[PDB]
Amino acid sequence: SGREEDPHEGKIWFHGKISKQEAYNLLMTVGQVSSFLVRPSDNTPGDYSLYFRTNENIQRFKISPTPNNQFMMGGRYYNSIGDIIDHYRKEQIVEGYYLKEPVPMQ
């Protein structure tokens, strides 16, 4: 390809080229409740946004890199975005909810 890609390009849950409205519409059509996807942040270069579908709405969470190869979400630190997804498949992300299926990059 000759490109240097985002380090998360090719991960099933990563969408590097959609809008926030497209994220909403994908989660409501392709996704199901507890589905999720990750986008680069629209407003903070270098950050990422995790979108999560509950029974009644979509929630957006900030993931921010540290200077030392880690990522911060909810005041906790993880070695990768994949580790954040592993964490919230086993611990509730919103009361009553875990991460279930990714919305695959379309």
Binding site: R60, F61, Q92, I93
Partner: peptide, 8 residues
């Protein structure tokens, strides 16, 4: 803005 997770 952004939501905070349950275990924040």
């Amino acid at each position: 803005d952004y939501a905070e997770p349950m275990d924040a």
